[PDB]
Design a protein around this nucleic acid. Structure first.
Ligand code: K
Ligand code: K
Ligand code: K
Ligand code: MG
Ligand code: MG
Ligand code: MG
Ligand code: MG
Ligand code: MG
Ligand code: MG
Ligand code: MG
Ligand code: MG
Ligand code: MG
Ligand code: MG
Ligand code: MG
Ligand code: MG
Ligand code: MG
Ligand code: MG
Ligand code: MG
Ligand code: MG
Ligand code: MG
Ligand code: MG
Ligand code: MG
Ligand code: MG
Ligand code: MG
Ligand code: MG
Ligand code: MG
Ligand code: MG
Ligand code: MG
Ligand code: MG
Ligand code: MG
Ligand code: MG
Lengths: 122, 244, 157, 77, 38, 46
RNA sequence: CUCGCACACGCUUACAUCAGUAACUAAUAAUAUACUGAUAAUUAACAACCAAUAAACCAAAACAACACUAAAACGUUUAUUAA
RNA sequence: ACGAGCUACCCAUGAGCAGUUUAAAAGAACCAACUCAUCUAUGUGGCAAAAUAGUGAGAAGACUUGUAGGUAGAGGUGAAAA
RNA sequence: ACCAAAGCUAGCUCAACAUACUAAACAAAUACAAAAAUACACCAAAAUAAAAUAAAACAUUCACCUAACAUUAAAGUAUAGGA
């Protein structure tokens, strides 16, 4: 008979069966059947300038390590937002109603890169 | 290896944990009470003890209910607590005769009924026993509000009761916006069935419906850690302020 | 690169360092394949292991900044929406959500998937519990037997 | 007369609404909260879909009388 | 509404326990029908 | 007149008769999947 | 002595380069399309994927001129839309 | 429960029949491809769990044939051979 | 003298206790022909278990056989059975 314990891919079926191997679509079908490739859907790779950048893929052996401290949501708040809040409260300018000046954002849909929906791929 | 808790108690212990635990106590108390329904098909014997005609001795007798099958079609109407009777029979009523499968079905009728509490007409598939119970209770609204869940055996009936029970507790002025005097008369007769609001919206709910309702009330978006940390910082600052 | 060293670098710095690693990793992969073609060993193959470790550490630290910032703004643990569902087989499956331009009730394909267990699944769900119980029961008794066996051959107590 | 439609071929009519919707002053319990079908819960009734921004290909065809050149007089072409 | 009774006797269970039901306890006989009464 | 070759291969027929989609469309078919998952089969269906 | 090239359906690297075969595979030996190890490969123009609604239109394919009975697969144009 | 990828019948969608004889594409005639399997001989753990060689019947039809779909065991299907 | 012979671990069985019961893994893809990012929906359902067997045949009947809440006794007693 046939092998039921192998990978079912496009190469096994007839000419009708053409399954992609995992690529992301970059367009659709137009009027005449010519593939209309949308410019926006193409992933535009963004690269910096490494000419004036001094850093190497390897680190010196004599460079000491450090105590592995994973970043915590509490430590980040105490590092960035706490000094601004603390100074304002001591000066009497703290406003519990509005916290947008400290980096808090009520709704994510306003900004370009959401967080909970995870808009950006990487 | 054997189960520590018997299998028959798995469903009962399912109610003691999770979302089922946070359900209101009054709803759970009514659900766990499995009272024997009013006999419909079988004819019970009043006496607990009977004398054997052959033996001429005092013996104990017990009523055993006859199982009855309720088709899903019944839940859309009011059958009065009855349904299909599944069983066997003997042809010619002789023991030494053939054994035959027999199904007895109730005779269904199409009627539209009027409810004073809701002032709406419902075309409900009713049986002759349901109409007799309506006359016995001296009112369609009385029949729904007096017969318990085990006697009604219809999800439409429970929802119909819940709709009217909420109507009385809320005292909605929408029953008759133009006849306030008529509104007072209608709710005066059913004043004995008035129940508080927290009890009137859970009488017609099944187990699945209640869990969805409980989740909807408890559906809360997570509180951002920015708000939690701001409150923590303010407490320390006020604590330091009061320390000087 | 160790994890701690990359936390001191700025986000702009990490972006530039990723491509420096990227160009290094491509060269190492080219050399490794060329080694197989020439039937000769790859010169110091541990370089590739070091680079991929640096890549993973760089990915971890940026992800440590993304989730920490997400918790402050929104408080959600996972960046992809989802909910616990019970599939037709009776299991509990974490169903990740997908992006659609139309709501759930207007989707032909989505409305064909079923998230609930039919009554006949109850018996099969029960049997899976028994199978896992026996596997764990056998494992626990095996640990006891080894402890007794080793004590006899090592009576140092 | 003899209408040329056939009951089986024509699109079926929507299923009858659940009895809960017929009870005045009673909020039905639907499965729209969990955005998937569940037995024992009432079928939700949704308002017609209203896309905020119009899309050319995927929008419904505009009515003929919406065209600016539409005229009541019947011209033969 | 039909009214039926079992042909075969059911053994007792006097401590508030559900009695044992056998196949031969499913054999019913129609003793009276409520629609035929005057 | 010379039996023995009753199996004529076809991917369209094989995936339509014993496919994973068909197994999940009938209530009896789902029980087949459940039995094979319980037994520990490597391949539940084609 | 003569069932040859190609496509569809099916099989799934069994194909190619190099090396080895004491033994495994070929119903034997040489040996290698069939056994073992390493490396390599099939590049789209062909093929799959490849719009919706309303309206006009009784008039067969058989060299189709024109006909037979068993009454026949096979669409264009106008209008409104189409990233 | 699972089976109409073989087979019986049917619904879709396709594809084949060259020459010769006749006003004929007439369930006519000669004879290939093609489809059935009459008679005999080999074969009988065989090349083959039904074949090979010779010889035969139809070969513009109630004909062969590819792809895919439908009917499931108290049944399906059948130009009845249980 | 060939072919062979010997070993004691892998793990398993039956309980007990016991938390209270679908493990491990889920970055991406998974009910289009599963593991194929992306389009106007339909969605769903129940009807007593039967028989092999025992009565030396077999028709009424035939323990357990889905749902009991246990143990020492009442007791294999009262009753139910082509009795
Ligand atoms: K092959
Ligand atoms: K078929
Ligand atoms: K052969
Ligand atoms: Mg196989
Ligand atoms: Mg293919
Ligand atoms: Mg092919
Ligand atoms: Mg193109
Ligand atoms: Mg007792
Ligand atoms: Mg076979
Ligand atoms: Mg075939
Ligand atoms: Mg093979
Ligand atoms: Mg050879
Ligand atoms: Mg060679
Ligand atoms: Mg080779
Ligand atoms: Mg077929
Ligand atoms: Mg010819
Ligand atoms: Mg002829
Ligand atoms: Mg021959
Ligand atoms: Mg011959
Ligand atoms: Mg001869
Ligand atoms: Mg001939
Ligand atoms: Mg002839
Ligand atoms: Mg079938
Ligand atoms: Mg038959
Ligand atoms: Mg025939
Ligand atoms: Mg005959
Ligand atoms: Mg005969
Ligand atoms: Mg016998
Ligand atoms: Mg005997
Ligand atoms: Mg029996
Ligand atoms: Mg008697």
């Amino acid at each position: 008979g046939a092998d039921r314990m192998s990978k079912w891919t496009s190469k096994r079926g007839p000419r009708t069966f053409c399954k992609g191997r995992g690529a992301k679509g970059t367009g659709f079908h137009g009027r005449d059947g010519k593939f209309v490739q949308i410019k926006e859907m193409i992933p535009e790779l963004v690269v910096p300038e490494l000419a004036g950048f001094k850093l190497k893929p390897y680190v010196n052996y004599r460079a000491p390590e450090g105590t592995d401290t994973p970043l915590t949501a509490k430590q980040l708040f105490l590092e960035t937002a706490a000094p601004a809040i603390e100074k304002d409260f001591k000066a009497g300018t703290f406003d519990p109603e509005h916290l947008e000046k400290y980096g808090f954002e009520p709704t994510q849909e306003g900004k370009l890169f959401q967080l909970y929906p995870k808009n950006f791929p990487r | 290896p054997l189960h520590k808790v018997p299998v028959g108690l798995w469903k009962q212990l399912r109610l003691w944990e999770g979302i089922y635990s946070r359900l209101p106590r009054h709803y759970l108390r009514s659900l766990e009470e499995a009272r024997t329904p009013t006999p419909v098909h079988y004819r019970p014997h009043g006496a607990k003890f009977k004398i054997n005609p052959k033996n001429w001795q005092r013996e104990r007798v017990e009523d055993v209910p006859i199982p009855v099958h309720y088709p899903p079609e019944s839940q859309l109407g009011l059958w009065g607590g009855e349904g299909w009777v599944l069983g066997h029979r003997y042809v010619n009523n002789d023991k030494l005769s053939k054994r035959v499968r027999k199904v007895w079905k109730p005779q269904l009728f199409q009627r539209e009924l009027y409810s004073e509490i809701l002032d709406k007409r419902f075309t409900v598939t009713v049986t002759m026993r349901t109409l007799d119970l309506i006359d016995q209770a001296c009112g369609f609204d009385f029949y729904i509000l007096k017969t318990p869940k085990e006697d009604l055996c219809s999800k439409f009936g429970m929802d119909l009761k819940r709709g009217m029970l909420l109507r009385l507790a809320r005292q909605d002025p929408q029953l008759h916006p133009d006849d306030p005097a008529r509104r007072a008369a209608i709710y005066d007769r059913y004043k004995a069935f008035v129940i508080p609001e927290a009890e009137a919206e859970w009488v017609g709910l099944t187990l699945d419906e209640a869990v969805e309702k409980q989740r909807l009330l408890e559906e809360k978006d997570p509180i951002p850690l920015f708000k939690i940390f701001v409150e923590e910082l303010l407490g320390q600052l006020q604590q330091q302020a009061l320390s000087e | 690169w160790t994890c701690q060293q990359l936390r001191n670098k700025s986000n702009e710095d990490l972006h530039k360092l990723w491509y420096v690693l990227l160009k290094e990793r491509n060269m190492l992969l080219t050399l490794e394949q060329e080694a197989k073609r020439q039937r000769l060993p790859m010169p110091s193959p541990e370089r590739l292991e070091k680079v991929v470790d640096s890549m993973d550490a760089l990915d971890k630290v940026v992800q440590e900044r993304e989730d920490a910032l997400r918790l402050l703004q929104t408080g959600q643990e996972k960046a992809r929406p989802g909910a616990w569902r019970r599939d037709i087989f009776g299991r509990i499956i974490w169903h990740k959500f997908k992006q659609w331009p139309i709501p759930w009730y207007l989707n032909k394909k989505y409305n064909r998937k079923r998230f609930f267990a039919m009554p006949y699944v109850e018996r099969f769900v029960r049997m899976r519990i028994e199978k896992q119980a026996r596997i764990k029961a056998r494992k626990r008794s095996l640990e006891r037997k080894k402890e007794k066996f080793l004590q006899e051959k090592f009576p140092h107590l | 007369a003899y209408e040329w439609g056939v009951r089986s071929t024509r699109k079926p009519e929507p299923p009858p609404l659940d009895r809960v919707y017929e009870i005045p002053g009673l909020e039905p319990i639907t499965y729209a909260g969990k955005m998937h079908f569940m037995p024992g819960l009432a079928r939700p009734v949704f308002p017609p879909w209203d896309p905020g921004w119009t899309h050319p290909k995927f929008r419904r065809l505009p009515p003929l009388h919406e065209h600016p050149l539409y005229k009541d007089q019947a011209c033969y072409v | 509404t039909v009214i039926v009774e079992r042909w075969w006797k059911v053994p007792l269970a006097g401590e508030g326990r559900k009695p044992r039901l056998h196949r031969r306890h499913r054999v019913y006989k129609l003793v009276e029908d409520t629609k035929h009464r005057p | 007149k010379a039996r023995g070759n009753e199996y004529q291969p076809s991917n369209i027929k094989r995936k339509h008769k014993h496919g994973w989609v068909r197994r999940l469309r009938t209530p009896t078919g789902v029980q087949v999947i459940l039995r094979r998952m319980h037994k520990g089969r490597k391949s539940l269906s084609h």
